[PDB]
């Protein structure tokens, strides 16, 4: 073969980029991407808190670098939003001293670097934010486009401004959370990593963004055991998720959450399931059941009826190709990461067996 | 009470509809019996961009026709030279779930966004060989369904929140908003008169906007189901539209109505992307059928097919000079047909 130096350099860039991509391919394949769904009364937030207890510590130096660039981007975006607001406002808010209006220029110039936050920028923005008239401008602009937690970043800046500093992960998560649209509520069990993706701050229609999640290893459909009447709407949400052409191949875990709240509702005897579901009068606790000690059989009959209603929908269509896996839980259950893991394993195994034709 | 407004709206809508029917003196398919059909179009996968990592969701050509961006829900925005198949850049993303990307008309910048409602802009003319976010043009309330650059300081974005929005990039404060749709908005296309951009609703309709006017000049509606993709005919006078209804449709602005449907009873799969050849004479559509169909834009002949994908076609693009047709499937493979 023959190349110019230009082609060779681009080929070495291509191979350098390839080696980088091949390193990321290992991280990608090693992560079980795992869409989370559930009507917001279903406490899916409280479920991801039971994942975040396993995510106790900052993920790695490479993840920490990725959030340093985000901390710096929100430091820059919050102070430049103020720097243009103090130009756009009708008050001639050139500072108390001309040096801050000169250092404002070298902020706009010095923010343009595709490298680490140099000590000059930190030195400028603390001297700016020391003027209480900037805190008053932050309260004048309180409903304009600004990062609402900017007063955290510009106060913590003192600790940010020097090499090898680390923030605690709730400051990072708080920095990132806005009108976000998803949350990547990461966790790991037995050194298996789940990028669980919650969907939230996102509009009432599913049928287009669901066509992203077609490759997630499983869908966790969290659903509220206790808010029957609403339950029948979630049963249609599950029926829709299940039959949807672009999810045909992906297995659904169900969490029947708020079991205890249903149990107390059933112990209260309101038993509106009989009204909302006449089939309850015919249905009875199957001998499949393995209840907890001290359950009222009615509580078993309720939970297993509801569960069997989801399973009925799961059984009616497509179950030749994708399973669904019910679990009974409450937000206190530490075992939820282990429940997710066991049936994530099963979903992968019971997928391989389709292609090894053992099924 | 709304009734009088719903009767007024009905009457206006009826007048608009009836006036269209009056202007529909003939179909396009009538007068194009003057036209020799295209020779049945043959193409081969004269490249495959094998090295992508997960399913490619979107792509866009650079105006130089040489480079193209592609983005995938592995979270890599990968920039390919179509000539050498060199991965000239591969840019990691602040969260993986892209749904769209675009190339600045200069080639200076690239953009993408997705279910994380954040748009981001990147500068390829780095000072130091590292590409990073120039600005994070956040502020939508739904997923950013499609981006296009008007200019290296102006970008329009669709959303699931029903709003198209134009951003002055340097300001980054939602510099115009075009709220008039219902449901999501799937896809955008810009005329060479970049003042005009069409956006496909996730209702049946398409709306034409003018960037300065800040509201829809027109609302085309011939489709039955969601418009998945949209593209101006190359002179800007007309635009194609794919739908989950499986039909392709061509609309002309001045006719304000459907000039030509493309369909077969064989083809139940929704169209997922559309674009024209440089002459406009070929309209290319990807499907849930992995085969692309190529249509004679004037004859409605299924003049050819591009079979060479093994999963849904996610996106399509024709170079500025019409030399070749990128197609991003839900395989990692981006195939450059020609």
């Amino acid at each position, epitope marked *: 073969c023959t190349l110019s130096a230009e082609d060779k350099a681009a080929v070495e860039r291509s191979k350098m980029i390839e080696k980088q991509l091949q390193k990321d391919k290992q991280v990608y394949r090693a992560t079980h991407r795992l869409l989370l769904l559930g009507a917001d009364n279903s406490g899916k937030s409280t479920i991801v808190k039971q994942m975040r207890i396993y995510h106790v510590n900052g993920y790695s130096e490479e993840e920490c670098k990725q959030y340093k660039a985000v901390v710096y981007s929100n430091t820059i975006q919050s102070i430049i939003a103020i720097i243009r607001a103090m130009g756009r406002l009708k008050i001639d808010f050139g500072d108390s001293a001309r040096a801050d209006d000169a250092r404002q220029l070298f902020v706009l110039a010095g923010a343009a670097e595709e490298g680490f936050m140099t000590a000059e920028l930190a030195g400028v923005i603390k001297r700016l934010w020391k003027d209480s008239g900037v805190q008053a401008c932050f309260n004048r602009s309180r409903e304009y486009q600004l990062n609402d937690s900017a007063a955290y970043y510009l106060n913590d800046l003192d600790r940010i401004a020097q090499p090898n500093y680390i923030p605690t992960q709730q400051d990072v998560l708080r920095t990132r959370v806005k009108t976000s649209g998803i949350f990547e509520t990461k966790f790991q069990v037995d050194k298996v990593n789940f990028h669980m993706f919650d969907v939230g701050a996102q509009r009432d229609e599913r049928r287009k963004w669901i066509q992203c999640f077609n490759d997630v290893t499983a869908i966790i459909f969290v659903v509220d055991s206790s808010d029957y009447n609403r339950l029948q709407e979630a049963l249609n949400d599950f029926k829709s998720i299940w039959n*949807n052409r672009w999810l045909r191949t992906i297995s659904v875990i169900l969490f029947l959450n708020k079991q205890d709240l249903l149990a107390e509702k059933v112990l209260a005897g309101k038993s509106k399931i009989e009204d909302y579901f006449p089939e309850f009068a015919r249905y009875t606790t199957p001998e499949d059941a393995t209840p907890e000690p001290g359950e009222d059989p009615r509580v078993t009959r309720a939970k297993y009826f509801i569960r069997d209603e989801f399973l009925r929908i799961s059984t009616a269509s497509g179950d030749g190709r994708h399973y669904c896996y019910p679990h009974f839980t409450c937000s206190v259950d530490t075992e939820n990461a282990r429940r997710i893991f066991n049936d994530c394993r099963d979903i992968i195994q019971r997928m391989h067996l389709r292609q090894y034709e053992l099924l | 009470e709304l009734d009088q407004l719903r009767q007024e709206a009905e009457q206006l809508k009826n007048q608009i509809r009836d006036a269209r029917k009056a202007c529909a003196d003939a179909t396009l398919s009538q007068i194009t019996n003057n036209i020799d059909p295209v020779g049945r179009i043959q193409m081969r996968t004269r490249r495959t961009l094998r090295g992508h990592l997960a399913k490619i969701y979107a792509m866009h050509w650079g105006t130089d026709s040489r480079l193209l961006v592609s983005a995938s829900q592995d979270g890599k925005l990968i920039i390919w030279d179509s000539y050498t198949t060199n991965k000239v850049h591969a840019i990691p993303l602040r969260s993986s779930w892209v749904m769209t990307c675009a190339y600045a008309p200069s080639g200076n910048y690239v953009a993408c966004g997705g279910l994380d409602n954040i748009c981001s802009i990147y500068n390829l003319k780095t000072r130091e060989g590292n590409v990073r976010v120039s600005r994070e043009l956040a502020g939508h309330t739904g997923y950013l369904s499609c981006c296009r650059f008007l200019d290296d300081n102006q970008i329009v974005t669709s959303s699931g929140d029903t709003t198209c929005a134009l951003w002055d990039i340097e300001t980054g404060q939602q510099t115009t908003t075009f709220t008039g749709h219902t449901g999501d908005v799937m896809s955008l296309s810009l005329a060479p008169d970049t003042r005009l951009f069409v956006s496909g609703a996730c209702d049946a309709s398409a709306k034409l906007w003018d960037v300065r006017e800040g509201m829809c000049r027109q609302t085309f509606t011939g489709h039955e189901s969601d418009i998945n993709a949209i593209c101006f005919f190359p002179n800007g006078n007309a635009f194609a539209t794919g739908s989950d209804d499986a039909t392709c449709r061509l609309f002309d602005l001045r006719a304000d109505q459907e000039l030509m449907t493309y369909s077969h009873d064989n083809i139940i799969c929704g169209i997922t992307s559309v674009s024209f050849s440089k002459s406009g004479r070929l309209l290319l559509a990807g499907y849930d059928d992995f085969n692309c169909n190529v249509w004679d834009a004037l004859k409605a002949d299924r003049a050819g097919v591009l079979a060479g994908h093994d999963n849904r076609v996610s996106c399509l693009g024709v170079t500025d000079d019409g030399m070749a047709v990128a197609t991003g499937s839900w395989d990692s493979f981006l195939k450059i047909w020609n």
Partner: nanobody
Amino acid sequence: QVQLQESGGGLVQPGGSLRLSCAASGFTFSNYKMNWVRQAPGKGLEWVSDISQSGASISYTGSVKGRFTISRDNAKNTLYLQMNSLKPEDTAVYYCARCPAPFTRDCFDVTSTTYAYRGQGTQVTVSS
């Protein structure tokens, strides 16, 4: 183009019976699964009933199994809802809702607020 109009609502006595109907236009109706969806006071958009393209596959919300019945005519491009043994809480705006896309089982979004392929609704009052 795509245009829907519900009909046959109004006041009716509790325990009474009534047929709603919907005329659908501007699309090939036989290709679509069809739904009735209701907005009572305080409730959200509850899915009430659905009918397949064939008219054969059918289901109902559990509080409406047997009490109502749904049917369609693929030639007349129309959807009917027979209602019987009406409970006062069945008082709602009833909407004819198409599933989003043709040849589907799927039927997402028919209960979503601001959804496209749903009519103007007909009010039904179950009261005396």
